[PDB]
């Protein structure tokens, strides 16, 4: 007589419905063979992003897009996620309208800032990197508090907008807890297809390594092959990235514990980074 409420089973909430012909589409923000995200103007909702599938997409991607709409509808608003603003469902393919983040993804932002960075006007600083790590931890703590896992946390899925605010995007693989980004995945996810709050924490560790290397690719010179899998399973881990303070590398190392039970929670990570910020 007692059941979990699965957000993907709930009905669409028509409060999100927006007239389709009041969108005016602009530049491409992301694209693949079966879908794209475009900038648009939305009369009566301002600048927004619109996620949509291409006519070649199969029914599985279409179901996945509606599921993502339903997860975002359930989660509610948070400063550190790219929030749902509206949807178009009647008489056409699903359009998911989200917030537009004017500075794009953090991976590309960090990479173009390498010549304008001090590791301590218009410069990226260590204070900014600490802030970004704090905000992403706050956003992931929010997801976990709603029993949600993201499953593709990476610097490429963190966007930057005004006020130096970072926002987690792309909830297409996000799941409620009752082809794959292998180098960001926890070993139990690779080996046993198991995803948990603790495997999101592993990915956050990889994200921190990206952050404090200003966007370097993880495990450089190590292709995904049988040798990569054995080395991760037997305990190989990346070294401290070049700009990480010792306290942040300590967080990374615990995020990468082979035992999920020994990894920190996002709530614990938030409180850790909070103490580091106050010490500054
Ligand atoms: C990977 N998948 C396979 C797809 C293709 C997909 C899957 C299913 C679909 F049905 C449709 C598409 C995909 C999903 N997601 C995204 N990204 C793109 C970035 N995007 C943004 N969202 C809000 N604002 N914003 C501002 C900027 C910005 C500002 N300056 N510059 C230079 C860029 C970028 C964004 C968030 C999501 N791209 C591709």
Numbering used by the authors: 567 to 611, 618 to 692, 761 to 818, 830 to 931
Pull verbatim passages from the article behind this deposition.
In general, all derivatives with modifications of the primary amine demonstrated strong inhibitory activities. To our delight, we were able to obtain co-crystal structures at high resolutions for each of the inhibitors 8-12 bound to KIT-wt (1.5–2.0 Å) and 9 bound to PDGFRA-T674I (2.6 Å). While the biochemical evaluation still revealed IC50 values in the sub-nanomolar range, blocking the ability for proton donation through H-bonding by double methylation was accompanied by a slight loss of potency by 3–5-fold. Lower inhibitory activity was observed in KIT cell lines for both alkylated derivatives 8 and 9 compared to PDGFRA cell lines.
Avapritinib is the only potent and selective inhibitor approved for the treatment of D842V-mutant gastrointestinal stromal tumors (GIST), the most common primary mutation of the platelet-derived growth factor receptor α (PDGFRA). Against this background, we solve the crystal structures of avapritinib in complex with wild-type and mutant PDGFRA and stem cell factor receptor (KIT), which provide evidence and understanding of inhibitor binding and lead to the identification of a sub-pocket (Gα-pocket). Furthermore, we report the identification of a sub-pocket (Gα-pocket) located in the N-lobe of the kinase domain, which is surrounded by amino acids of key regulatory elements such as the Gly-rich loop and the αC-helix.
